[PDB]
Each structure stands twice: as structure tokens, then as C-alpha cells.
Scaffold this active site. Structure first.
Site, PDB file in Angstrom:
ATOM      1  N   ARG A  47       0.806  -1.230   0.156  1.00  0.00           N
ATOM      2  CA  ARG A  47       0.078  -0.085  -0.097  1.00  0.00           C
ATOM      3  C   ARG A  47       0.912   1.291  -0.049  1.00  0.00           C
ATOM      4  O   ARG A  47       0.590   2.252  -0.680  1.00  0.00           O
ATOM      5  CB  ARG A  47      -0.976  -0.118   1.227  1.00  0.00           C
ATOM      6  CG  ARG A  47      -1.823   1.303   1.254  1.00  0.00           C
ATOM      7  CD  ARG A  47      -2.786   1.232   2.597  1.00  0.00           C
ATOM      8  NE  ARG A  47      -3.401   2.536   2.423  1.00  0.00           N
ATOM      9  CZ  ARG A  47      -3.803   3.470   3.411  1.00  0.00           C
ATOM     10  NH1 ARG A  47      -3.018   3.219   4.379  1.00  0.00           N
ATOM     11  NH2 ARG A  47      -4.492   4.264   3.111  1.00  0.00           N
ATOM     12  N   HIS A  51       0.825   4.073  -2.871  1.00  0.00           N
ATOM     13  CA  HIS A  51       0.503   5.687  -2.861  1.00  0.00           C
ATOM     14  C   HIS A  51       1.652   6.545  -3.071  1.00  0.00           C
ATOM     15  O   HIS A  51       1.481   7.627  -3.326  1.00  0.00           O
ATOM     16  CB  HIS A  51       0.002   5.643  -1.037  1.00  0.00           C
ATOM     17  CG  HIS A  51      -1.060   5.432  -0.912  1.00  0.00           C
ATOM     18  ND1 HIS A  51      -1.881   5.858   0.322  1.00  0.00           N
ATOM     19  CD2 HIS A  51      -2.180   4.794  -1.427  1.00  0.00           C
ATOM     20  CE1 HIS A  51      -3.076   5.485   0.215  1.00  0.00           C
ATOM     21  NE2 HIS A  51      -3.442   4.965  -0.787  1.00  0.00           N
ATOM     22  N   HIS A 174      -5.948  -5.861  -3.222  1.00  0.00           N
ATOM     23  CA  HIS A 174      -7.055  -5.785  -1.795  1.00  0.00           C
ATOM     24  C   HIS A 174      -7.386  -7.106  -1.424  1.00  0.00           C
ATOM     25  O   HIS A 174      -8.223  -7.254  -0.443  1.00  0.00           O
ATOM     26  CB  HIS A 174      -8.269  -4.971  -2.245  1.00  0.00           C
ATOM     27  CG  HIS A 174      -8.036  -3.596  -1.969  1.00  0.00           C
ATOM     28  ND1 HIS A 174      -9.052  -2.725  -2.669  1.00  0.00           N
ATOM     29  CD2 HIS A 174      -7.203  -2.841  -1.694  1.00  0.00           C
ATOM     30  CE1 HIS A 174      -8.519  -1.581  -2.228  1.00  0.00           C
ATOM     31  NE2 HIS A 174      -7.397  -1.554  -1.667  1.00  0.00           N
ATOM     32  N   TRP A 190     -10.860  -7.748   3.324  1.00  0.00           N
ATOM     33  CA  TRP A 190     -11.691  -8.302   2.169  1.00  0.00           C
ATOM     34  C   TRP A 190     -11.736  -9.896   2.021  1.00  0.00           C
ATOM     35  O   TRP A 190     -12.359 -10.555   1.387  1.00  0.00           O
ATOM     36  CB  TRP A 190     -10.844  -7.688   0.885  1.00  0.00           C
ATOM     37  CG  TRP A 190     -10.955  -5.970   0.868  1.00  0.00           C
ATOM     38  CD1 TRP A 190     -11.833  -5.242   0.135  1.00  0.00           C
ATOM     39  CD2 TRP A 190     -10.096  -5.223   1.178  1.00  0.00           C
ATOM     40  NE1 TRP A 190     -11.459  -4.116   0.257  1.00  0.00           N
ATOM     41  CE2 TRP A 190     -10.349  -4.111   0.898  1.00  0.00           C
ATOM     42  CE3 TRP A 190      -8.701  -5.259   2.066  1.00  0.00           C
ATOM     43  CZ2 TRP A 190      -9.698  -2.880   1.113  1.00  0.00           C
ATOM     44  CZ3 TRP A 190      -8.002  -4.369   2.275  1.00  0.00           C
ATOM     45  CH2 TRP A 190      -8.311  -3.132   1.963  1.00  0.00           C
TER      46      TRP A 190
HETATM   47  C1  HEM Z   1      -9.826   2.882  -6.109  1.00  0.00           C
HETATM   48  C2  HEM Z   1      -8.617   2.825  -5.677  1.00  0.00           C
HETATM   49  C3  HEM Z   1      -8.511   2.442  -4.249  1.00  0.00           C
HETATM   50  C4  HEM Z   1      -8.961   2.863  -3.210  1.00  0.00           C
HETATM   51  C5  HEM Z   1     -10.216   3.915  -3.092  1.00  0.00           C
HETATM   52  C6  HEM Z   1      -8.270   2.097  -2.402  1.00  0.00           C
HETATM   53  C7  HEM Z   1      -8.618   2.358  -0.858  1.00  0.00           C
HETATM   54  C8  HEM Z   1      -8.001   1.751   0.074  1.00  0.00           C
HETATM   55  C9  HEM Z   1      -8.247   1.930   1.699  1.00  0.00           C
HETATM   56  C10 HEM Z   1      -9.484   3.007   2.196  1.00  0.00           C
HETATM   57  C11 HEM Z   1      -7.555   0.877   2.275  1.00  0.00           C
HETATM   58  C12 HEM Z   1      -7.666   0.790   3.880  1.00  0.00           C
HETATM   59  C13 HEM Z   1      -6.482   1.767   4.580  1.00  0.00           C
HETATM   60  C14 HEM Z   1      -6.749   1.537   6.149  1.00  0.00           C
HETATM   61  O1  HEM Z   1      -7.703   1.645   6.422  1.00  0.00           O
HETATM   62  O2  HEM Z   1      -5.768   1.605   6.928  1.00  0.00           O
HETATM   63  C15 HEM Z   1      -6.805   0.362   1.555  1.00  0.00           C
HETATM   64  C16 HEM Z   1      -6.066  -0.864   1.762  1.00  0.00           C
HETATM   65  C17 HEM Z   1      -5.134  -1.247   0.906  1.00  0.00           C
HETATM   66  N1  HEM Z   1      -4.959  -0.887  -0.342  1.00  0.00           N
HETATM   67 FE1  HEM Z   1      -6.147   0.267  -1.440  1.00  0.00          FE
HETATM   68  N2  HEM Z   1      -7.381   1.377  -2.507  1.00  0.00           N
HETATM   69  C18 HEM Z   1      -7.389   1.500  -3.620  1.00  0.00           C
HETATM   70  C19 HEM Z   1      -6.574   0.649  -4.829  1.00  0.00           C
HETATM   71  C20 HEM Z   1      -5.488   0.204  -4.207  1.00  0.00           C
HETATM   72  C21 HEM Z   1      -4.194  -0.270  -5.266  1.00  0.00           C
HETATM   73  C22 HEM Z   1      -4.294   0.115  -6.705  1.00  0.00           C
HETATM   74  C23 HEM Z   1      -3.831  -1.040  -4.551  1.00  0.00           C
HETATM   75  C24 HEM Z   1      -2.383  -1.570  -4.659  1.00  0.00           C
HETATM   76  C25 HEM Z   1      -2.075  -1.819  -6.109  1.00  0.00           C
HETATM   77  C26 HEM Z   1      -4.151  -1.105  -3.253  1.00  0.00           C
HETATM   78  C27 HEM Z   1      -3.633  -1.777  -2.072  1.00  0.00           C
HETATM   79  C28 HEM Z   1      -3.916  -1.713  -0.955  1.00  0.00           C
HETATM   80  C29 HEM Z   1      -3.623  -2.600   0.211  1.00  0.00           C
HETATM   81  C30 HEM Z   1      -2.435  -3.575   0.052  1.00  0.00           C
HETATM   82  C31 HEM Z   1      -4.120  -2.190   1.455  1.00  0.00           C
HETATM   83  C32 HEM Z   1      -4.022  -2.826   2.773  1.00  0.00           C
HETATM   84  C33 HEM Z   1      -3.098  -1.975   3.578  1.00  0.00           C
HETATM   85  C34 HEM Z   1      -2.923  -2.733   4.918  1.00  0.00           C
HETATM   86  O3  HEM Z   1      -3.186  -3.886   5.302  1.00  0.00           O
HETATM   87  O4  HEM Z   1      -2.555  -1.947   6.063  1.00  0.00           O
HETATM   88  N3  HEM Z   1      -5.153  -0.387  -3.137  1.00  0.00           N
HETATM   89  N4  HEM Z   1      -7.166   0.666   0.251  1.00  0.00           N
END
Ligand code: HEM
Ligand SMILES: c1ccc2[nH]cnc2c1
Length: 293
Positions: A47, A51, A174, A190
Site C-alpha cells: 500500500r 501511494h 486488496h 476483504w
Molecule cells: C480505487 C482505488 C483504491 C482505493 C479507494 C483504495 C482504498 C483503500 C483503503 C481505504 C484502504 C484501507 C486503509 C486503512 O484503513 O488503513 C486500502 C487498503 C489497501 N489498499 Fe487500497 N485502494 C485502492 C486501490 C489500491 C491499489 C491500486 C492498491 C495496490 C495496487 C491497493 C492496495 C491496498 C492495500 C495493500 C491495502 C492494505 C493496507 C493494510 O493492510 O494496511 N489499493 N485501500
């Protein structure tokens, strides 16, 4: 002409040089695996990689992974990046061990390490990012909102030069990790396999029974009886006919998912960068298991 970012290799370093950096990260990944209720640092690192790259504008080549600007306050304190200080602090000893590697390279390398180490596809990676000054830091607001529908996502990703197949594949990331109420205003995973890279994102997307609810922050999210969730932006990937067929495609075929994700994550991490014809070819690092460790 937009701005040009030329990849300059750190002086006299090479593959088995960056290979050592990969090893320190994958090793630390096994050492502090108690992080976030034993999910590990894997997810937060991918993530973090997404970012620092996802700030890019293809129009004028601002933002992107090249400059390493996250290390600056403004980008660091971006509400869109809340929770990522967890990945910063993890990469910090590793930066003192190898203080010759650029932030940009370190941030992107950590995401690559994480995907391969959670048994995901191989991601070819290139070095050459150079640290740029504070005022090179992009303004907050360039990363996406979770509360939107299918065509927000579509327009949005056009700025990152990504098409339908590419955005559906990137989102498969995700399967990893969870949302944290205090970070994003969303709570729940998820999936069940939190720290191994699979195609479960699309499976759950097509197999569970979903309900629209407000969470404790009073935001809408999709909840399943199994105890999983989906963001409004995640759930739109099945509300939209074009996204829908690519989702069904990835739920039937995890090998296609792996290759499409590999290409899309590499592109993502390199957007905005110019590589000279005499630059070293992309590195494919060996996993820790491929080296008997
Ligand atoms: C429409 C686009 C996206 C949105 C709106 C989005 C939104 C989010 C949100 C809100 C979280 C939760 C973070 C938290 O609460 O701490 C999250 C987690 C995450 N997102 Fe996204 N995301 C998007 C696309 C992506 C993309 C492109 C990737 C990587 C290629 C990605 C990888 C992740 C990962 C790995 C997490 C897990 C973080 C953790 O476990 O601490 N996401 N995302
Ligand atoms: C990891 C840890 C500390 C850092 N300071 C600047 N970039 C960094 C990356």
C-alpha cells in the site's frame, strides 16, 4: 515537453547490490510477523508502494515514485496516507543499513519484496530514482476516495495512464490486509488469506452475499455474512459491465491475474521515469526460498 526524470543508478551499485536490500526486507518481514494481529508488514508495504506512485499526473509528470517525496511532512501527513507511517518506520532501519539507496527506490522495492514474499507473481523492478527537494512534493488530494462509483474510478485512473484491464488487476492487491477504522473510516478485511497473494478478491467479490451498511464511522460499506467487506469503489467493479467481465476473468484464472498484475504494478511503479538506453535491465530478484533462506 513535460518535466523529465532521468534514472541515475546509485554510484557503482548493481543487481546483487539491490539483491542484498531485498534480503534485508524479506528477512525483517519474517521477524516482525506479529504486526497488526499477525498479518505482518506485507500488506502495508504494498500500500505504501502504491501511494508514493499513485500521486502521478501523466499531464505534467508531477508526483510519482521518482522523487521520494513521501519522506516530507506534507505528503506524510496526507489523510489519504494515514497508517502508512507503519511502513515507513519498518523501512527505517533498513535505510540506515544501506544509506546509499534512494527513498524512491526503497519505497518501491519494499512493495515488490512484499508481493513476491507473500507468494505473489514476480515483479521486475528498476533502480535509478533520485531524491528531489521539498517543494517537489505534490499537494494532497491526488489519491482516490473510497466512497464513489464505477466511473469515478475510471476517470481517476486515466490520470495514471491505466485502462480497464489494468485497474481491475491492480485492485486484486486488496486480497491483502485490512481496512482500519481509525485510518480510513472503514473496518474489516476483504478476505481470509490476509498475507498471501491470491485471486480471492474477485472470488469473494462474486461469491458472497453482500449488504450495504454504515460502519462505526457512519460510512457506507458492503458487508458479507462471512465477516468480510468491500469498499463502494470495490463493489462498483461488479456494478459496471466492462469491469465485471474482467473480474469474472480473474476469478476463473489466477495465472492471468498474476501476469496482468505484474505488468500493471511495474508500470505503476515506473510512471514518469525515463530510462537511458545504457541503463541496466530490470532486475528479477529471487525469493528467500529460491536462495535457501
Ligand atoms: C480505487 C482505488 C483504491 C482505493 C479507494 C483504495 C482504498 C483503500 C483503503 C481505504 C484502504 C484501507 C486503509 C486503512 O484503513 O488503513 C486500502 C487498503 C489497501 N489498499 Fe487500497 N485502494 C485502492 C486501490 C489500491 C491499489 C491500486 C492498491 C495496490 C495496487 C491497493 C492496495 C491496498 C492495500 C495493500 C491495502 C492494505 C493496507 C493494510 O493492510 O494496511 N489499493 N485501500
Ligand atoms: C526509509 C526510512 C527513512 C527514510 N528517510 C528518507 N527516506 C527514508 C526511507
Amino acid at each position: 515537453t513535460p518535466l523529465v526524470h532521468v534514472a541515475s543508478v546509485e554510484k557503482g551499485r548493481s543487481y546483487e547490490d539491490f539483491q542484498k536490500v531485498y534480503n534485508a526486507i524479506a528477512l525483517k518481514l519474517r521477524e516482525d510477523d506479529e504486526y497488526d494481529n499477525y498479518i505482518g508488514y506485507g500488506p502495508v508495504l504494498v500500500r505504501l508502494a502504491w501511494h508514493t506512485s499513485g500521486t502521478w499526473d501523466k499531464h505534467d509528470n508531477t508526483g510519482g515514485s521518482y522523487g521520494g517525496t513521501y519522506r516530507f511532512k506534507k505528503e506524510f501527513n496526507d489523510p489519504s496516507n494515514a497508517g502508512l507511517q507503519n511502513g515507513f518506520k519498518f523501512l527505517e532501519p533498513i535505510h540506515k543499513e544501506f544509506p546509499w539507496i534512494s527513498s524512491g527506490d526503497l519505497f518501491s522495492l519494499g512493495g515488490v519484496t512484499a508481493v513476491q514474499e507473500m507468494q505473489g507473481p514476480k515483479i521486475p523492478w528498476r533502480c535509478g530514482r533520485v531524491d528531489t527537494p521539498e517543494d517537489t512534493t505534490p499537494d494532497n488530494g491526488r489519491l482516490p476516495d473510497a466512497d464513489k462509483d464505477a466511473d469515478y474510478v475510471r476517470t481517476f485512473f486515466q490520470r495514471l495512464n491505466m485502462n480497464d484491464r489494468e485497474v481491475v488487476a491492480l485492485m486484486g492487491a486488496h486480497a491483502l490486509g485490512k481496512t482500519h477504522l481509525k485510518n480510513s473510516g472503514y473496518e474489516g478485511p476483504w478476505g481470509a488469506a490476509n498475507n498471501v497473494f491470491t485471486n480471492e478478491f474477485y472470488l469473494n467479490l462474486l461469491n458472497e452475499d453482500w449488504k450495504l451498511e454504515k460502519n462505526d464511522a457512519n460510512n457506507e460499506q458492503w458487508d458479507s455474512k462471512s465477516g468480510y467487506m468491500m469498499l463502494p469503489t470495490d463493489y462498483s467493479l461488479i456494478q459496471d459491465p466492462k469491469y465485471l467481465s474482467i473480474v469474472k476473468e480473474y476469478a476463473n484464472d489466477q495465472d492471468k491475474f498474476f501476469k496482468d498484475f505484474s505488468k500493471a504494478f511495474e508500470k505503476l511503479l515506473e510512471n514518469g521515469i525515463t530510462f537511458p538506453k545504457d541503463a541496466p535491465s530490470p532486475f528479477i530478484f529471487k525469493t528467500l526460498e529460491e536462495q535457501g533462506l
